[PDB]
Amino acid sequence: IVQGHNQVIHQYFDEKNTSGVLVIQTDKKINLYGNALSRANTEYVPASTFKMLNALIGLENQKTDINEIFKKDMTLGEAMKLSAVPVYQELARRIGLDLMQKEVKRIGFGNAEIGQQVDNFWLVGPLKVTPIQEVEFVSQLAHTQLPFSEKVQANVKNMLLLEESNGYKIFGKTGWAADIKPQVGWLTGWVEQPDGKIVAFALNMEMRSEMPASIRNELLMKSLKQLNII
Ligand SMILES: *C(=O)[C@@H]([C@@H]1NC(C(=O)O)=C(S[C@H]2CN[C@@H](C(=O)N(C)C)C2)[C@@H]1C)[C@@H](C)O
To answer: How far is CA 219 from the centre of its chain?
Structure first.
């Protein structure tokens, strides 16, 4: 885990007047970029990035399936990108506290502590995770190396497609914990390059209420281009 060639990307974060880190994981190597590199090994609430693990747990334990319509009426996959209806809260209650805690410990996600409220522990605590831990988790998902069904991992990966450009596929999940102080913003995912190679990323930055949600994607894309990952 090493600071990368950071001269330019550091300035990208500086221009937004906030602190952020970008963690990049290729085969074996992790590199750190941004203007607040200590964030990479700092624990934060995962916020909506936990939807990835919620979905894996719910699908693996047959508490839902990819075709179920949650009463706008929505599937699990549509709810991955949009939060108009509380699908993942409902799924967490179906899973229940016992099974959720067992699965979170089996995966070893972050500090693996979910407390006693099964439907909000990922937003206000006590569950916390570092950006390095998030990039390792999503790298395992991208490579079908998590200890879940191969089909479940493929189904969750398919829910996470963000953009496709000139043969590159960008997968990922945003999160924003706006009700804690300081606010935390996430964009965690991976690039599938045209030849099949995977480069995983975790962007983590301090948010403020006036920022557009798209600031995370903007910083990510500019940085990935500067690093020649896309
Ligand atoms: C997950 O972190 C939350 C979910 N994700 C998300 C995002 O990453 O952009 C938004 S939070 C952010 C968007 N606008 C602000 C807002 O208050 N709402 C439109 C609700 C905050 C979205 C709510 C959530 C499921 O925890």
So the answer is: 15
